[PDB]
């Protein structure tokens, strides 16, 4: 057809995800992942993108015949410098390198992705979309940690927040599903995927969110601790023969659900629980307790809440998680309906009972589509 | 009279507080503080207790003529080893020394207090009461952090919780004020003093509390950060030329309200706010936002909440804090009455409106009295 398309890239430490997608229709011509980078047949990100071109081809796509208008790059951390979708050039990239102590785990891979893509696809505009952007204007009372002001301002320490593309997109789609204007709505979004984060949103403006300086803070996640006394770092440095980097690494990769149960995948977790694994049930109960607290905390932040929406891989599919996250909260205005909450369902949908004072939905997220539409917009429309 | 009395000691790094108190009547024959220890006329804790005997004398007390039956010692951290009031001897003390990496800031001073007191008052039983004790049996889902299980179990890492004496005592006094059995009540207690912590309590059993491995976690406090991404430690070690101990120290002493405003005392803070100090208003708003979240989180933990009680130096006296902590929560069941919430009031009292689905009280805490009654009990009654 005469349809235009964006190639959306999510470049991680050892993986590269891509989707070629039509921003007007939302259809994805092709999608895939290149894994096990630099361990194996794909030693670097240059090979990974070349390998992705093969995958696109053997899947029937020809990039010249496809209406390619831009390349979107997911960058986790924009600091206080980049919050809007940003057209990439050499100067911008130099400024991005200044963010790498704020995001030493998550940002450097995205920048490798950008270098490779701009070289192998120099014919088209490249755009960065930042996971922190939606949250740049959090209220000061929520964005500011209670630490020494001088040091916080000097090293740009604040609650940045992440999954900003998902939280924003889901908040818009919840408004659309309810057929009510976004500007008049107060809502909570629960993005429960590999990373897990919650947000409280009034109209178009977020009021709070669970991730922090980095994507470690907040909810229990697949491999991340979420909330824990920062004293654990000093404690382990003093007792367990660990340096600060060993502790940070453990909190990011050996914690969360995998730290408590030995698995990171929630389907695997449910199998373990059903076979009587005590550690798996504990891990699930720790996850669920943390999640319930954040829902409560955000009902209090908002004061009035119209809708709570579950999203991402767990939120979209795990009926038990959703049941256990809001059970016993009838007196707080939340009532779930068992039929509406059934597993295997697709599409934006109501899972609350009809008379629930607060509406509860599942609203599938589509970060790639939202990033494709951001790219299209910033390039003149 | 024929009245018996306990000398309750709270020994800190640079201070020693004491109160001589009648456990049956609750009257305090004498109370005071010895300050600026080892900086000055009182270089060590041996001098501080001798100096406290002077203070007791010049205030009209004679310890032999006073009915002294025990000495109570406040110990912050009991780990997993001590949770009930514990009669002190040399063996117990040896085991307490094993807790000093869990509590390097708070415990060592208490142990100096114990050594001095047992030497200068060898005629009577000495008892330790632990700030962690009330929380020893938190549910596993609340007590367990989502980190590597092996390492957590090896180094005894869990949510311990503190102000346990206050939370328990206030929960009992709230039941007494409402004339309803404790066992049937679900409640939240907000101990807002120098340290600040919240608890959620079902009957006689706590379900969660805001302090953690150490007294740093949770609410914003006078000089403590409360909740912050643990990544801040690694971040500052990598950027700001700080070691892990410098960061820990900053979070404990140069953070909270003093970190954001330059003052730690809430009366001073209110003066600054009233004169138009922007930093003081920000500090207050950060404190208040954190507090509102914990109230919300704990309403969700409990599912049904009968009563919320404010206590300690701020909770008992700062009407603005209490107003701002629960305003705009009518839809969550909380309605405050302006007349009932007036400053300067004394005694256990209702601050909610009559028709508030959830009752809100101020319930003055008396940790010394509760510790005196614990000492009396464990020594045969
Ligand atoms: Mn995703
Ligand atoms: Mn106190």
From Swiss-Prot, chains A, B:
Name of the featured protein: Acetate kinase
Keyword terms, alphabetized: ATP-binding, Cytoplasm, Kinase, Magnesium, Metal-binding, Nucleotide-binding, Transferase
Reaction equations catalysed: acetate + ATP = acetyl phosphate + ADP
Cofactor note: Mg(2+). Can also accept Mn(2+).
Location of this chain's protein in the cell: Cytoplasm
SUPFAM superfamilies named in the record: Actin-like ATPase domain
Catalytic-site annotation from UniProt: 131
Homology family: Belongs to the acetokinase family.
Any GO BP: acetyl-CoA biosynthetic process
Binding locations of Mg(2+): 10, 367
Gene name of the record: ackA
Cofactor(s) for this UniProt protein: Mg(2+); Mn(2+)
Annotated positions binding substrate: 74
GO MF term (any one): ATP binding
């Amino acid at each position: 057809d005469g349809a235009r398309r964006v190639l959306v890239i999510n470049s991680g430490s050892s993986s590269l995800k891509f989707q070629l997608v039509d921003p007007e229709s939302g259809v994805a011509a092709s999608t895939g992942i290149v894994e096990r980078i630099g361990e194996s047949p794909v030693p670097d990100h240059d090979a990974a993108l070349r390998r992705a071109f093969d995958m696109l081809a053997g899947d029937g796509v020809d990039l010249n015949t496809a209406g390619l208008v831009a390349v979107g790059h997911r960058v986790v951390h924009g600091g206080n410098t980049f919050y809007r979708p940003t057209v990439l050039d050499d100067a911008v990239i130099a400024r991005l390198h200044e963010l790498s102590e704020l995001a030493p785990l998550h940002n450097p891979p995205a920048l490798l992705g950008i270098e490779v893509a701009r070289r192998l696809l120099p014919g088209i505009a490249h755009v960065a979309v930042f996971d922190t952007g939606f949250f740049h204007d959090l209220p000061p009372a929520a964005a500011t940690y209670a630490i020494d002001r001088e040091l916080a301002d000097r090293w740009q320490i604040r609650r940045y927040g992440f999954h900003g593309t998902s939280h924003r997109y889901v908040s818009e789609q919840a408004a659309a599903f309810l057929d009510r204007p976004l500007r008049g709505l107060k809502q909570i979004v629960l993005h429960l995927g590999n990373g897990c984060s919650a947000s409280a949103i009034a109209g178009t403006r977020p009021l709070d969110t669970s991730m922090g300086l980095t994507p470690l803070e907040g909810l229990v996640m697949g491999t991340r601790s979420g909330d824990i006394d920062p004293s654990v770092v000093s404690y382990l440095c003093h007792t367990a023969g660990m340096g600060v980097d060993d502790v940070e690494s453990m909190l990011n990769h050996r914690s969360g659900v995998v730290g408590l149960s030995g698995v990171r995948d929630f389907r695997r977790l449910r199998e373990l629980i059903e076979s009587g694994d005590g550690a798996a049930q504990l891990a699930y109960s720790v996850f669920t307790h943390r999640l319930r607290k954040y829902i409560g905390a955000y009902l209090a932040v908002l004061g009035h809440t119209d809708v709570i929406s579950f999203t991402a891989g767990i939120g979209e599919n795990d009926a038990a998680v959703r049941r256990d996250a809001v059970s016993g909260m009838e007196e707080l205005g939340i009532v779930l309906d068992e039929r509406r909450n059934l597993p295997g369902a697709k599409g934006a949908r109501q899972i609350s009972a009809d008379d629930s004072p607060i509406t509860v939905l599942v609203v599938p997220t589509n970060e790639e589509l939202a990033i494709a539409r951001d790219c299209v917009r910033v390039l003149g429309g």
